[model samples]
Target: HLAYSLDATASFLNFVSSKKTHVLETHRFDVLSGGISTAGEAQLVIDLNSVNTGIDVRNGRMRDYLFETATYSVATVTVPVDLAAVAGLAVGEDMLVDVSATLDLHGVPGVIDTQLNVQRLSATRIMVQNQSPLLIKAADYSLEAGIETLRNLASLNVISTTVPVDFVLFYEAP
Candidate 1:
């Protein structure tokens, strides 16, 4: 019950980026990897190049300027979990936990602390959701220059430097 592998096909992660104060848009990555271990460790890896925003041109631009996938192709999040307690949740039972995790992107690392709602969907599967969106800042990961480039290329009045990220992850026991 303590060890589980991430079900990438059933999991989803996304973020909302704002532009021009009122234009809020959501985006997602096509590929994800990582899982939790019986030893109480968990992680998720995102392929930055796979970012999808519904616009091919914009997606290409973002990959080239914003994420710079050529140099930083992936981003990772890691958390230390109390697997014994987490895996003990009964089916249909859910609990909220304050989770602090490390996020590594663009060669920089940052801490993200938020509330997570965890539930046991079945004896072999667990679901995790964020109680609230986690705030991420471009400056924290040295992506401010990339944001500036995007702004100039698109001639936008303002592109938010801070974004709200959320996810629902499914882990399955062996």
Candidate 2:
């Protein structure tokens, strides 16, 4: 098992538009720690108010209507793994591990399985990269408000579901 914490500043989401668009540069993840018997806890914060889709109106709508940032604020995921079975990995080597965890969004908890690549960078530090893509549906998280309005105003396709998430983490041994 590996223990790690995410570097929120180094991770971001890319939302494609007519010419490849980027949104929200200020998303953050916190309190991520994992080990054999100990569980990892973390919060993924999506700053709707900080979203910059290049269109001011669109960003405002995403914050006020879709995400309801005022009420929900952020999304979170918690994980716990058995470390004894994964103790033999050598430094600088990478391996895929299955993560069984609960994702909490809009107050709903869903079970999700994903893969993480662990690389030992030093005697006391390890870098972890989430190799599996986290695909999510807007409707599943109740983020459909004002989506139809966007369909008519923009040339972009109104996304219904499936948003991809990628994360990178660096951790120190405890």
Candidate 3:
């Protein structure tokens, strides 16, 4: 199996919004990333407070209510993969692969199976990008109240409860 190692850097989380009207927004959040636990898993702990939506008003609202960055300050995703399948990939060539993972948010669990475009950047590195935004429901994570709060705050025509989450992960061989 191929194992990825972080060299104290080269790891980040990219997220996008799913407003009814294209917000043209992205959140470049920071995460404490790693791999190779004896438990046979790779994990990334994303700092919810680090979300950059380009507007302090929305960012503050997201922290104070939407994600409750105070109570639940982070979201964890555990990706368990067979690296051998990823190992033989040619550099710059992408293959759509089904990734088995879990999203632990708001202290609840949501299992995930998503097709991602996996591209080997080099012998030492690879990138996994979501082929399409994974559609997630706020209610699934027990966050419908938060979604309501956001809608009420914005007074918008539509604030979709079904949010689309996208990610790009960079993995490096130790």
Candidate 4:
């Protein structure tokens, strides 16, 4: 990660699910995309239809009804990053950087400013991880109706209207 680098995979976890709260583990990313970039300007698209909640049936409901994967299929985030923040790190060194990103989700545009942990895992691999969850409101993307549909489908007494999304980016040296 010291000399040359390119390409990245961006994936976000749905902290919205749990046995006690959601439907499954929040580790695996269902909404994700692949792209090419270094510690510079980067853009990754989120395939809303790819959203996985571990449960196939639930995943289907999310795609078919909530995210309406049939119609709206993509969401993208473009962040201009300064990898120079970690330019002096030795292998295994970790650095923290705040990144400002713009998102286009559900056909709506929004902005996010968050801090992330950047680390040089090795000469061949790099890791960029977010330390905190970013809250995304369905209403922000004009998705309130879909949220209502999911709430009715789940028959939950109460379901929060926001989703806390977290991301981890994996990069490989070019």
Candidate 1, 1-174: lDDT as tens digits? 348888999888999989996799999998888789778888899989889999999999889988888998999999988887776799989888888889999889988888888899998888988887688999999989998998999999999999889899998888
lDDT by residue for model 2 over 21-108, one digit each (tens)? 4332332222232332235443344444565666578777666665566876666566664444334567777778787767776656
Q: Which regions of candidate 1 deviate over 4 angstroms?
A: none
Q: In candidate 2, where is summed lDDT lowest over 10 consecutive residues? A: 28-37
**Which number leads on TM-score?**
1
Candidate 3 clashes between residue pairs 3 or more apart in a chain or in different chains: none
Top lDDT model:
1
Candidate 4: where is the Cα deviation over 4 Å?
A: 1-12, 17-28, 36-39
Clashes of each: 0, 2, 0, 3
Tens-digit lDDT string for candidate 3 (1-174) = 437764325665565556668654566775555564434577777788887778889888888888898889988888776677677788887788777888899889888888878788998788876898678778888888887787789886566677666666777886
Of 1 and 3, the candidate ahead on TM-score is 1
Ranking by TM-score: 1, 3, 4, 2
lDDT of 4 by residue, 1-174 (tens): 223333434334455643326554462445565543564666667777777667888878777777787877877877776656555668999887787888887778888788878788776666777777777777888877876777788776556666777766766655
Q: For each candidate, what TM-score against the reference?
A: 0.95, 0.66, 0.82, 0.79
For candidate 1, the 10 contiguous residues with the lowest summed lDDT are: 1-10
